[PDB]
Amino acid sequence: MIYLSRLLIDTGGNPDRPRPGRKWLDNIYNVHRRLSMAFPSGLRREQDPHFLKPFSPNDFQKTPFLFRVDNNIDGNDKRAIIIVQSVLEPDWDYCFQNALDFLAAPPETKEYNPEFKAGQLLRFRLRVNASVRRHIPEMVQQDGQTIETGKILHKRVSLTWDASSTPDQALADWLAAKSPKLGFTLQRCELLQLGWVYGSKPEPKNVKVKEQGQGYWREHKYNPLRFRAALLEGVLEVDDPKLFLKTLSSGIGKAKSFGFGLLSVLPI
């Protein structure tokens, strides 16, 4: 089965007070990690039920989940919504048992068994990673004069349109170039919000050999993480059954570990 969840964050009120939940959302590595401890090891939940031990990546089960973050829900209060889709049952009472100030409402979970027929009108919302891998020459220095070096870089850059086409048309072309393999066809697709996402990540680096030996002394060094994001909403029609279900809970684009593929489907 498929499991969907919702988390609510205030993100508002008095700006003069500490707001740890508001601070948690500025980094996407932290958001992904915080969703990632929501699944302990059969042994871990018997070892520390209080979640008061050092966190290591190896004592938690591995599952390729997908998530998206949304905003602007009114009702005289501001809210931030995290929607998590996974193939195992999340344990929301273990991830946030010492972090209740993050959220303005207790978490909720429900089952999801979506069964469809071919040729069905469906409403979808998706934020896509607009990236293309390209060949780039190497520019260095730029100390008032550009120095060229013959190395050609294979790097992942954003998709680029020309000067005479709208971004929505090029994004729709990029999505309809891919929709035959996933199992769907477009009729309409408009661009809502396009932008960048920054993240920072700890990475260990060696410094000095221990005098007593057995390892190093080490120091954390932090590496940037830049991605392109474009949020899209539209109406699609199904072309294959086990193929649309092959599209769901697997992803459509790249960077899925950092919340870049999630299909939210409504039968219109």
């Binding site: 410094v207 000095k208 002394w217 080490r218 120091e219 954390h220």
Partner: protein, 48 residues
């Protein structure tokens, strides 16, 4: 019975004065670890 005389010796010219060669007071250990020492920053970084 025996015969006894008395003599005197002024210090500083034919007998020297040795140093203390030790510690008298005991006192407890050192609290107040310094937070600008290099070993502290190295251990803090490794623990992080």
């Amino acid at each position: 019975p025996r015969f006894v005389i008395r003599r005197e010796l002024v210090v500083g010219e034919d007998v020297q004065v040795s140093r203390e060669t030790g510690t008298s007071v005991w006192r407890p250990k050192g609290t107040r670890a310094d937070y600008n020492n290099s070993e502290y920053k190295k251990v803090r970084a490794e623990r992080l």
